[model samples]
Target chain A: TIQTAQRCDHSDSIRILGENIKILDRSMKTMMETMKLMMEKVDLLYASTAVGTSAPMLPSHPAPPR
Target chain B: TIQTAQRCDHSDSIRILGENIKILDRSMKTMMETMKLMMEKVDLLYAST
Candidate 1:
């Protein structure tokens, strides 16, 4: 952990002593998690919409020869 | 308490008795509390960053 923090520039050898790190994440993870869940459900719903639209619509642009 | 709703648009007059009102922030408070706890934990983690 010490080595990793040092590489990431997250460590202060003088203040942190190259070890003894405290994990601090005061952000609203739960609220964010709820939002994330809502977003995921919405995206899945969008993905399902394509399943019913199978008509091959003609492209406005000319297609190159295959 | 009487003017609590006057300052904020969150209160309805007649529909809300125009004076007396119940705390509308019911479930939201619970959600906020849980969210706050999660935030504290997250802060602890980030500070370690």
Candidate 2:
């Protein structure tokens, strides 16, 4: 029931939105890759440092030895 | 006649879907902000060394 021009406009709008989603998806993926690489570098730094042999701090204590 | 309850149920489903989209929008915004903060941290690390 909508006019042809209006329908075409709606189609174009949806297409634009789809394209935007694709761009956003790519950017999110790229940022995740960058984050992974940064973490890897941090891990490497830790491995190369003197403190690397230290155990990580744990928040919980043993339950009174059950 | 169309079932009155069915129409109402359909409306509710659409509303829930709309709410889900809004939640997704917020999470996406948060992720982008986190990414920005992380990049800033990385830049600082590079600058310090």
Candidate 3:
């Protein structure tokens, strides 16, 4: 038993907004997973380079004639 | 008389990802906004004092 004016609600607008938020969540989740895969590949590349007996990890030690 | 399974149009979702470059960069930028909000709150607290 309340005597208060009802507030107008944009139901469709709120629905679209909710859908957009769900889309955003999926987008963020996939990007996170993809990034994890990318980092794994990067570390693997580093490991391979590091394992090589010569010229490992960029120009850390230039093999110039000493 | 046909029935469809639970399927969603992920075009917009993928578009969001493509438009935002990398999540790391987006994460950094989003936190920058968060930091801005945090500072605003702190300033408001000081104002009340």
Candidate 4:
């Protein structure tokens, strides 16, 4: 009887872990998109400068709020 | 008996949640560090011109 109960609890924990991983995966995907956009903006600024002109100012990047 | 079982399950979920949050916090911290370094490098490049 105790074994059966522990097995059920283990299953429940496994399901929750699966769900948690999915959520984390989605969050990571969203973070990467934001990072990509920031990188692209920085790249654009670097590309805009003339070879002999003054160095371009650094682009402002947005961070996700905590 | 059923209440006890449910409570145990809830506690398990909470523990998992806490662990996940810690991982996310660490990930964000590392990302910020990388970003800070990249920004500094970019700033230096800009200043050089």
Candidate 5:
């Protein structure tokens, strides 16, 4: 007899924590990919400066990797 | 009384989940701040262009 967010049990913790952690992992992974791509874009822009060309537009809202 | 993660009781779940979620929140918050700072750097790059 207790009051809390949810039921207790290794089962519940394992299930819920595992689920949220997976979601967080996926989100983090995609975010990392996006950052990598951003760096690539920055490099291209860097090169563009030397070539006397217009810099490529950065994505305001890039899509996730996954 | 059951064999589970550690024990059975709303108290356990609430305590553990609350603590973990807070950690997750802090991590997420820091990550977001990093991204923002990175964006600022990119904007400086853009300005360089």
Candidate 6:
């Protein structure tokens, strides 16, 4: 959690308040990893297929009625 | 979603469950593919010159 680390920069050095900042770093890394994987799979599935007049996909899947 | 497939540290096994973690790992590839498609479309459309 680089963002959390930045926050701890201004905190008082006389206390143990910086612990949570480390936790944030761990969590950020965790989710970043997952997001990266999902993005790759989605790309591979959608990017290679041809897109011509006979393509199976619709230009816009009809949205569910609000 | 394996960050080097390391154990999820900074989290407790019984009490502290850390934060709302987990994000895409292949994001860069997806972005690259999207950019490629976009560029191709733009170049073809502009070829109408």
- Tell me the alpha-carbon RMSD of every candidate: 23.0, 8.9, 19.0, 8.1, 8.2, 15.1
TM-score of chain A of each: 0.36, 0.60, 0.55, 0.62, 0.54, 0.49
What lDDT tens digits, residue by residue, belong to model 2 across residues A5-49? 332234454455566567668767977787876776565555556
Q: Name the 10 consecutive residues with the lowest summed lDDT in model 4 chain A.
A: A56-65
CAPRI classification of candidate 1: incorrect
Residue-wise C-alpha lDDT for candidate 6, range B19-38, written one tens digit per residue: 32222223334445655644
lDDT of 6 by residue, A7-37 (tens): 4343244123345545665675686577567
lDDT of each: 0.44, 0.60, 0.47, 0.66, 0.67, 0.42
Cα RMSD for predicted model 5: 8.2
Where does model 4 sit among the CAPRI classes?
Answer: incorrect
TM-score value, chain A, candidate 4: 0.62
All candidates: TM-score: 0.25, 0.48, 0.38, 0.49, 0.50, 0.32
Whole-model lDDT, model 1: 0.44
Candidates 2 and 3 compared: the better one by lDDT is 2
Please provide, for model 3 over B1-49, each residue's C-alpha lDDT reduced to its tens digit, 9 standing for 90 to 100: 0111112234565566455446546664554554454444344435434
Better of 2 and 6 by DockQ: 2
Summing lDDT over every window of 10 consecutive residues in candidate 5 chain A, give the lowest-scoring window: A1-10
TM-score, B chain alone, candidates in order = 0.47, 0.70, 0.54, 0.71, 0.69, 0.47
User: Can you tell me the DockQ of model 1?
Assistant: 0.04
Instruction: Kindly indicate the candidate among 1 and 6 with the higher DockQ.
Output: 1
Q: What TM value does chain B of candidate 6 have?
A: 0.47
Residue-wise C-alpha lDDT for candidate 5, range A18-50, written one tens digit per residue: 777776787688678768767776777657664
